[PDB]
Amino acid sequence: SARRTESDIQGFHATPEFGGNLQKVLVDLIELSLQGKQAHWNVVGSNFRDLHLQLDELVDFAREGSDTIAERMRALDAVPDGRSDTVAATTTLPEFPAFERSTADVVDLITTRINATVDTIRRVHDAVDAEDPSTADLLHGLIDGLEKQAWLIRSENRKV
Amino acid sequence: MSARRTESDIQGFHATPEFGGNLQKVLVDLIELSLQGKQAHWNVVGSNFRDLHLQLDELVDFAREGSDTIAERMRALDAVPDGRSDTVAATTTLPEFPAFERSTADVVDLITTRINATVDTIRRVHDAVDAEDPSTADLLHGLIDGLEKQAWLIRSENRKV
Amino acid sequence: SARRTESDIQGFHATPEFGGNLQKVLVDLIELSLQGKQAHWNVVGSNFRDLHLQLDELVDFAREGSDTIAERMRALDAVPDGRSDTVAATTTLPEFPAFERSTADVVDLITTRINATVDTIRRVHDAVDAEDPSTADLLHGLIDGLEKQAWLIRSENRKV
Amino acid sequence: SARRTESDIQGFHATPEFGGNLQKVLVDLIELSLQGKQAHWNVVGSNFRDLHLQLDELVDFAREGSDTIAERMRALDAVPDGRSDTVAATTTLPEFPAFERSTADVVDLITTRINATVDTIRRVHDAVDAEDPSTADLLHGLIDGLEKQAWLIRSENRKV
Amino acid sequence: SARRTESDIQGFHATPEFGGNLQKVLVDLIELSLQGKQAHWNVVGSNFRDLHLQLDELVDFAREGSDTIAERMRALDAVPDGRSDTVAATTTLPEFPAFERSTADVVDLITTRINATVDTIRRVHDAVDAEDPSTADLLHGLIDGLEKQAWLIRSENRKV
Amino acid sequence: MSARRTESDIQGFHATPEFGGNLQKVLVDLIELSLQGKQAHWNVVGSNFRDLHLQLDELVDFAREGSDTIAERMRALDAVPDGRSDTVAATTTLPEFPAFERSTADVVDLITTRINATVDTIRRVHDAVDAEDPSTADLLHGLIDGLEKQAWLIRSENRKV
Amino acid sequence: MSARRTESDIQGFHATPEFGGNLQKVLVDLIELSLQGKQAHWNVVGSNFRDLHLQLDELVDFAREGSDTIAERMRALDAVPDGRSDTVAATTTLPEFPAFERSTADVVDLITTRINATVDTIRRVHDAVDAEDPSTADLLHGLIDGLEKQAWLIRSENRKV
Amino acid sequence: MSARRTESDIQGFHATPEFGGNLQKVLVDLIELSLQGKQAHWNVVGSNFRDLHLQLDELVDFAREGSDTIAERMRALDAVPDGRSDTVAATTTLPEFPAFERSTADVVDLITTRINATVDTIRRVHDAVDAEDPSTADLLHGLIDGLEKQAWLIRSENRKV
Amino acid sequence: MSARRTESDIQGFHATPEFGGNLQKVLVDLIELSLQGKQAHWNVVGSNFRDLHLQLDELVDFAREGSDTIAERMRALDAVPDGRSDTVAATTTLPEFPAFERSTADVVDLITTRINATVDTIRRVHDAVDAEDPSTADLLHGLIDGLEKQAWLIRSENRKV
Amino acid sequence: SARRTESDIQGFHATPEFGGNLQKVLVDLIELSLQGKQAHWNVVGSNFRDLHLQLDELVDFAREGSDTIAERMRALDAVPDGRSDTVAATTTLPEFPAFERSTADVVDLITTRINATVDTIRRVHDAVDAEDPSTADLLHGLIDGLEKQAWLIRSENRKV
Amino acid sequence: MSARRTESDIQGFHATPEFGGNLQKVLVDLIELSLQGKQAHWNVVGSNFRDLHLQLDELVDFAREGSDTIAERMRALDAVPDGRSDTVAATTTLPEFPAFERSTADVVDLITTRINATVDTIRRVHDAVDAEDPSTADLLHGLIDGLEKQAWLIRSENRKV
Amino acid sequence: SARRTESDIQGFHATPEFGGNLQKVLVDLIELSLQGKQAHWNVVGSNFRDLHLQLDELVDFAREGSDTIAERMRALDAVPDGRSDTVAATTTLPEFPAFERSTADVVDLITTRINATVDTIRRVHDAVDAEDPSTADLLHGLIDGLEKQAWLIRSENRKV
């Protein structure tokens, strides 16, 4: 009775600006994963084990987030681009030092990197939400996870 | 001090009839999607039969979970869901499925169209549902994104280069 | 030495009457699943929780049974039809009431529905078994499960 | 290269009003957990087992919700206060009776207290959403869960 | 539509002879469980560990079989009676010795008792199958399991 | 090497016949409790059937585990348990369980009485068992705890306040 | 007041040589099916390679379990199974598998025909096996319907519209 | 049948009001320990944050399980536990936990002191509890063991050798 | 707040040197039992090899867990365990285990004797340990129960009836 | 950059001699699996259960090893041949007796068969390793597992 | 009677700069393989899309595990891995992946060639790595055969008869 | 066919030098396990929890390694000797201190003892690999695991 009598019903399509914003999020997530693995390998010093395990947890979370963002881009008829050259040439995260680093320096660096990653998502959020609340919810989840990880990492260096 | 309330019977949030009707529309489309997905799951045949067979079962599981969530939300908001077969058949908006064995390309086309119809209904309902209750709007967002991911995974088989 | 010299060996094929009997079973299983979900949602009153959980168990069992029957139909070169219009127009289960119902009424209604579903299987059993004992075994399993569920549901209203 | 230069990138901090609203939510969640445990221990009568198990599920949900809220406060650079004296002096939930109670009375009391807990979250939701949609999402999840638990508990005493 | 009009469709009820046959099976299953536990505790000698574990497996199988039979009786509107006095007065298994026994004697005794238990089921099978193939299937499963356990236990004393 | 004992065969602790009989009483009562719990589990009908149906299964599982533990302790202490049906029927102390279907209130009363009888037997045996072997007294403590919790969970249904 | 049997040595059910031979036929066909399924699993190439690769592993697992069940039933009925390689090769009825790499369609056809041959053997044996022992006939029914489901899942790839 | 008791209603062990208050003290101290453990878990900062953050969660879980066990034992022995927030705040013996963020050394000292206070309360009540019911004394032994192991694992951080 | 203690540092229970030595004896015997159990597990041959091979692994796991529990209790009670190889070898009381391959009967006899020696040591220590700390006496009870069950399960192989 | 400018890069290809040596290994693994199952079924006598379970473990290990070897052949562009006629006509293991056998005879036979299977691998090891250390590692694992299984089986008959 | 060493600071094995460089080459190729595998996983479209989608995810997981293992081995051998994005992009040897959506056959070809390049690099490095440290050569063998199995499973899709 | 005729094919037998080398490995593994447990119990100071958990992981690894070595010795027809007196008299690890130690001292001591254990295996590796590459593979795995544990432990005391 209420059935729709057509055979071609097409889905929601993302705008190029929306795809660009999601690309901006994805590149930073991938770079965060790579730098987290770097710090996970080369951290050394007092209280080494806790940082060694927390950085692995952060890397797992960032990998899951990047996969979720790229699959959302695919679902919205966009084309993600996560190649190494593109990530290196278009990421906004500061470069990571190349040698062994103490735990305090690693804590500071990782906190700054997570803060930059969250800032990118916060800048993208209003424009994304103006079109797709479903994508805005994914952004909310990413922000929650990243901020929790940032707290758990930064609390080591607090003085009170 | 003491900030405790004295009232002994505090009542909860009650939904409006229009809100209940919108949730009923979403529920009936989810149920019809589950039934049609099982039909396609059984009667599909041809190339990539195994992949279509498994993906349609995943879609059916997702749709069943979504319909249960929507109906329980209506129950929590003091509404009465109606998921009877006669009501679903008479009030669903998805086009009817073909009766006999179908090739995999035809099944891909049909399932993509029906998933698109379901998400279109949810998107039509989302504005009023969000205006009344963002807690229910969150469930609507979850359904929309899950269904769109399933639609991508199913439709990508027929896409050319 | 004893190897068969054939290149195409064909399997067992079901008769249209056998397919019709299995369709009769399948339609009632699907309608039972739908009515069980409806009662699961709309039940209310004393001893609400046990009915709420038992009806979910019954729905899971009925869904598994319908899938098994339809896959057996496919294996025997038959075509199941589980569309909503077909189920609504050809089911034998009585119609379910549309509003909130007390637990005693739900117990009575669900017991009646399960009894009708079992009666259909018992009616088609001899004709099915005359051709396919392998399908008769599936019918035996369905009857066992449905009767156990009916006992567990109906025992609530017993007075002794 | 689009990499940032800043080496001390800072994060998002919450306002005192935001911290106060989250404290208002947290104290009610803790008090709900304590009262749920009390009702779980001291309930007697018909449907005792179902009430016993449902109240334990509600307590588990309230505990995880309070933990989530407090960790979000820590992530946003706020300081939660979940001490017994603070909860007792600042909670808004009505006081729970001290002796053994029948299941109908426990159902009424627990439904009332869950409704009060949900009302607090609904009161703070507008401001917390205007400041941080990421926290608004957590409060949406809390409201959904609490309302489902309220329905499951309260359906026992419905007449028809 | 083909929906039924009746609102009080009744189920299948068992005859007193059917109930008696199922009681005959049930008492032997319970006695087999008790004697298996006795032999499990009081066995000594060579291959003690293997006998100790195999008898526990046999007891578990007998317990689940007795539960299945009694629940089938309940589903078919019969009343099982598995009290200690009834089992002791009406069982057909030979009495078990009261003290510590070597493994060869335990093997012989347990094999004889399993054979008697299987013989009872084979005696009642024809009538129970003529009445209810659904119950005949459960008895087929019981016979299969008991005979496999009997083989596994009895193979220890075989010469070559 | 300095403190090593030169003994070639060191034997363990052996239980007296009084201790063996004290454990035999507990064993036969646990077995009879398991049998009566299964009977009540099968034949209970009436209002609130499901909760009692499941709690009786929990009680039967606990009683079976306890009887196995007691019999294995008897074996470890060089005693010979006797859990045969004739012995249990002739020497158990639990009152006989009635036949036919019973309502849930009657089943609650009967099961509470029989659990209390079992706990009373364990308490009577505990003094001598503890005076001889605290390791066995600990097992008795565990059994009393479990049985009393089961008794509370079962009897609270029929309470009136 | 005692129905206990006096006989101290009670013997079980013994199978006939014809029954043992029928079960031997079923066993040897199951073993040959497992071997050929593994061969096809290794040597298949072409389109839908992954799907056939996984499905053939599932079929091989099913056939191995079925052969074990049949042989253990033979042992329980006081018969002696013979699953040696020479006996299987000299007495199996399945046509031999090709020696080299095969395409997907060829593997589908070959495996479908071999599964059909195995099911035909079991169906030929079922009448006598059921006439002697319905307990073994039940295992035969389980093998038949499992193999037919596997045959449907494998053969559905090559069907047209 | 010969030794069966003819009693129709056998009642169980009942706890005295002194015993009930003795268990109430343990209950309120365990609840306050759980609350203060959660507070310290949230608000701890400084060097070696993660290990203390996780150990405090372990301590809170143990204390919650212990309080549940004590209250259920009170219910089984016909007593009425009182774990309301007002009662805990008014009648607990643990010293008040300071507010705001605290370094890890201060948290270690505070948590060690409060665990020691809880164990001291349990040790004070143990004599009378054991003199009345060894079954409850066993629960007290388990609580003391767990709390002392947690105290060692937490306090070992500040040891200087 | 009314009953809160004003103490700023509350210390816990401390063990005496005699108590520490009483626990040290149990510790060294458990460690030596683990080492000899592994030795017998590796070097046993003869009839019924597999059952003894697996039971000795179970015994070794139990002894390792028990030694860890005892040492952690010593740490909790402010004692210092010493489980070094030289100390164990010089102060253990278990008789030396013979070298080379041994038959299963000899291994059964040796392992039974050494388990009995360990249990005898624990029983000798139990009186003073219980007189000082029932919480530690409970751990001793658990160890005695487990070791005696293992001894029964191992020694029952050589029984002749 | 250091990126390679090729569109089709060839892999490692196995020589026919290497394929033949792996075929020699595979045939013996398959024959060992079949003979292990036969001994597992037909073993009987004292200590029956231990052999019954150890032979299952041996068969599982041999099946896994044969699958690994055949998949390595496929990866190295070779074609395995595991047909029944080929195995029967080209295996090196001695024929297995056709009837029920005591546990001592089964121990001797299985030990001999495992020794022959290990001897084949040891014979082909040097030639395999001269080309592919990656395949040599698989051979090492097979030898370790087979020798451990042989020790566990053969220790039953040891007299000291 | 003591073979204990007197030296108080025994140092471990240290790798050479050439060894570190070879392991760095292996690591950078593994990282680039993971990135390109994820790219192909996202942007593959056409026939057999589901199988390619799942297999590429399996390959990415394997490559990630291998890169972690290699970097941890360098850390254990006192070397410093460098897995930064700029370094990977500037020093990897795998040819770059195309930018847009690609069909199934093209993805199969590209991934096969890149896996072959990675395993070729590992084979080039293996000789020196084995000459210095067989413990690291073992990890190299594991990487080689895992990657070759993945390459077979992926490339078999396009193979003809 | 190609079937062998021999019925008593024998296996590979180890030389006394091989047995001595494996005994040298085994005694050091056992002593490492004992000293790891000692350090696990008696460690105090900063990062106590991390040292406590890492030493337990090291003890588990050493236990499984010693079991693997002894079972390989048994498979190769050798007789391991892991008695307490033998370990104490023939081990090469330095003696461990007897009282409570700070975490830095425990880190130094455990790193030294792990290095000695690895040096023993590296000393015996050439001969054991010249005789049996299958055993050389087990020693490769042991070396890899021990060196990873040594890195994870010593990284705590590294300056920068």
Rg (CA), chain F: 19
Could you tell me how far CA C52 lies from the centroid of its own chain? 20
Rg (CA), chain I: 19
Query: Which residues of E fall in the annotated binding site for Fe(3+)?
Result: 40, 56, 67, 71
Cβ neighbour number for residue I109 with a 10 Å cutoff: 16
Q: What residues in chain I have their Cβ under 8 A from chain E's Cβ atoms?
A: 47-48, 51, 54-55, 153, 156-157, 159-161
Please answer yes or no on whether K157 and G47 come within 8 Å at the CB atom. yes
Q: Which residue of A has its CA nearest to B94?
A: A3
Contacts of H82 in chain D (CB under 8 A): 38, 98
Q: Do chains I and L touch (3 or more CB pairs under 8 A)?
A: yes
| Total count of domains within chain A | 1
CATH at E111: 1.20.1260.10
Domain assignment present for residue G84? The answer is: yes
Please answer yes or no on whether G113 and C8 come within 8 Å at the CB atom. yes
Distance in Å, alpha carbon of H112 to nearest chain F alpha carbon: 30
Q: Is I93 exposed, middle or buried (0-12, 13-18, 19+ CB in 10 A)?
A: middle
Please answer yes or no on whether H161 and L102 come within 8 Å at the CB atom. yes
Residue type, K23: L
Q: Which tokens hold the place of B140?
A: 């609507």
Phi-psi region of D124 (alpha: psi -120 to 50; beta: other; left: phi over 0): alpha
The chains found to touch L (3+ Cβ pairs under 8 angstroms) are A, H, I, J, K
Distance in Å, alpha carbon of A159 to nearest chain K alpha carbon: 31
Residue type, D14: A
**Paired residues of I137 in beta bridges:** none
Spatial neighbors of F131 by CB under 8 A, at least 6 apart, are none
Whether the CA torsion D83, D85, D89, D91 is positive or negative: it is positive
Q: CA-to-CA distance for K87 and K85, rounded, in angstroms?
A: 5
Q: Do chains G and J touch (3 or more CB pairs under 8 A)?
A: yes
Q: Which tokens hold the place of J83?
A: 């047909």
Cβ contacts of J34-37, under 8 Å, gap ≥ 24: J34/G31, J34/G83, J34/G84, J34/G85, J34/G88, J34/J87, J35/G84, J35/G85, J35/J93, J35/J96, J35/J110, J35/J113, J36/J62, J36/J110, J36/J113, J37/G68, J37/G71, J37/G83
**Paired residues of G141 in beta bridges:** none
Please answer yes or no on whether I100 and L79 come within 8 Å at the CB atom. yes
Domain assignment present for residue H31? The answer is: yes
* CB-CB contact of A20 with A78 (8 Å): no
Q: Do strands E101-102 and E43-44 pair parallel, antiparallel, or not at all (unpaired)?
A: parallel
Residue G138 assigned to a binding site? yes
* CB-CB contact of B140 with K82 (8 Å): no
* CB-CB contact of E42 with E100 (8 Å): yes
Domain holding B100, by residue range, is 6-161
* CB-CB contact of L121 with L143 (8 Å): yes
Q: What is the resolution of this structure in A?
A: 2.9
- DSSP symbol at C157: G
Q: CA-to-CA distance for B57 and J18, rounded, in angstroms?
A: 45
Q: Which tokens hold the place of A53?
A: 């395990």
Q: CA-to-CA distance for B122 and C46, rounded, in angstroms?
A: 35
Distance in Å, alpha carbon of K15 to nearest chain B alpha carbon: 48
* CB-CB contact of L78 with L14 (8 Å): yes
Q: What residues in chain B have their Cβ under 8 A from chain G's Cβ atoms?
A: 45-51, 53, 101-103
Spatial neighbors of F38 by CB under 8 A, at least 6 apart, are E67, E70, E82, F56, F60
Whether the CA torsion J65, J68, J74, J77 is positive or negative: it is negative
DSSP-derived secondary structure for J1-62? ------S--------HHHHHHHHHHHHHHHHHHHHHHHHHHHB-STTHHHHHHHHHHHHHHH
Contacts of K31 in chain A (CB under 8 A): 34, 84
Please answer yes or no on whether H153 and L50 come within 8 Å at the CB atom. no
Distance in Å, alpha carbon of D114 to nearest chain B alpha carbon: 9
Query: Which among C3, C71, C137 has CB closest to G96?
Result: C3
Q: Which tokens hold the place of K47?
A: 């026939």
Query: Which among L90, L141, L148 has CB closest to K72?
Result: L148
Cβ neighbour number for residue F3 with a 10 Å cutoff: 11
Q: Do chains L and H touch (3 or more CB pairs under 8 A)?
A: yes
Q: Is A17 exposed, middle or buried (0-12, 13-18, 19+ CB in 10 A)?
A: exposed
Q: Where are the alpha helices (DSSP H) in chain H?
A: 17-43, 49-76, 85-91, 104-132, 134-155
Spatial neighbors of K142 by CB under 8 A, at least 6 apart, are J137
Domain assignment present for residue F143? The answer is: yes
Phi/psi for L29 (5° steps) reads: -60, -45
Q: Which residue of A has its CA nearest to D140?
A: A137
Q: Which residue of J has its CA nearest to E52?
A: J49
**Paired residues of I44 in beta bridges:** I102
Q: Which residue of H has its CA nearest to L49?
A: H51
**Paired residues of F44 in beta bridges:** F102
Please answer yes or no on whether L156 and A100 come within 8 Å at the CB atom. no
Closest by CA to A83, choosing from A131, A37, A30, A134, is: A30
DSSP-derived secondary structure for A17-58? HHHHHHHHHHHHHHHHHHHHHHHHHHB-STTHHHHHHHHHHH
Domain assignment present for residue B1? The answer is: no
Buried b or exposed e, range F16-45, using 16+ CB within 10 angstroms: eeebbebbbbbbbbbbbbbbbbbbbbbbbb
Please answer yes or no on whether F71 and E31 come within 8 Å at the CB atom. no
Domain assignment present for residue K1? The answer is: no
Contacts of J53 in chain I (CB under 8 A): 50
Q: Is C35 exposed, middle or buried (0-12, 13-18, 19+ CB in 10 A)?
A: buried
Q: CA-to-CA distance for E42 and K40, rounded, in angstroms?
A: 66
Q: CA-to-CA distance for K112 and K118, rounded, in angstroms?
A: 10
Please answer yes or no on whether G49 and K156 come within 8 Å at the CB atom. yes
Please answer yes or no on whether G43 and J98 come within 8 Å at the CB atom. no
> What is residue C58's three-state secondary structure?
helix
Q: Is F100 exposed, middle or buried (0-12, 13-18, 19+ CB in 10 A)?
A: exposed
B83 to B34, B87, C40: CA distances (angstroms): 12, 7, 11
Q: Which residue has the tokens 């609130």?
A: F48
Q: CA-to-CA distance for K30 and J121, rounded, in angstroms?
A: 33
Residue type, E121: I
Distance in Å, alpha carbon of H67 to nearest chain L alpha carbon: 26
Spatial neighbors of H152 by CB under 8 A, at least 6 apart, are I72, I75, I76
Closest by CA to F148, choosing from F122, F125, F130, is: F122
Contacts of E72 in chain C (CB under 8 A): 144, 148
* CB-CB contact of A58 with K97 (8 Å): no
- SS3 annotation, D35-104: HHHHHHHHEECCCHHHHHHHHHHHHHHHHHHHHHHHHHHHHCCCCCCCCHHHHHHHCCCCCCCCCCEEHH
DSSP-derived secondary structure for I33-62? HHHHHHHHHHHB-STTHHHHHHHHHHHHHH
Q: CA-to-CA distance for F157 and D45, rounded, in angstroms?
A: 5
**Paired residues of G44 in beta bridges:** G102
Spatial neighbors of B82 by CB under 8 A, at least 6 apart, are B24, B27, B28, C38, C98
Distance in Å, alpha carbon of H12 to nearest chain D alpha carbon: 18
* CB-CB contact of L23 with L81 (8 Å): yes
Whether the CA torsion D105, D111, D115, D121 is positive or negative: it is positive
Domain assignment present for residue G1? The answer is: no
Residue C100 assigned to a binding site? no
Closest by CA to F28, choosing from E106, E100, E38, is: E38
* CB-CB contact of D95 with D73 (8 Å): no
Q: CA-to-CA distance for F84 and F65, rounded, in angstroms?
A: 17
Q: CA-to-CA distance for A107 and A109, rounded, in angstroms?
A: 6
> What is residue F15's three-state secondary structure?
coil
Contacts of F47 in chain D (CB under 8 A): 46
Q: CA-to-CA distance for A63 and H140, rounded, in angstroms?
A: 47
Q: Which residue has the tokens 């015997």?
A: I29
L118 to B59, I84, K135, L25, L144: CA distances (angstroms): 54, 20, 12, 9, 9
F39 to E18, E38, E58: CA distances (angstroms): 19, 21, 21
Q: CA-to-CA distance for D25 and J115, rounded, in angstroms?
A: 72
**How long is chain G?**
161
Q: What's the angle, vertex CA C134, arms to CA C130 and CA C136, rounded to 5?
A: 55
Q: Do chains D and G touch (3 or more CB pairs under 8 A)?
A: no
Determine the residue among F41, F50, F103 to mutate to test chain C binding: the one whose Cβ has the most chain C Cβ atoms within 10 Å: F50
Cβ neighbour number for residue G96 with a 10 Å cutoff: 15
Please answer yes or no on whether I84 and L42 come within 8 Å at the CB atom. no
> What is residue D4's three-state secondary structure?
coil
- DSSP symbol at B98: P
Domain assignment present for residue H154? The answer is: yes
Spatial neighbors of E43 by CB under 8 A, at least 6 apart, are E51, E52, E55, E100, E101, E102, E103, E106, I156
Contacts of H53 in chain A (CB under 8 A): 152
Q: What residues in chain G have their Cβ under 8 A from chain E's Cβ atoms?
A: 1-13, 72-73, 75-77, 134-135, 138-139
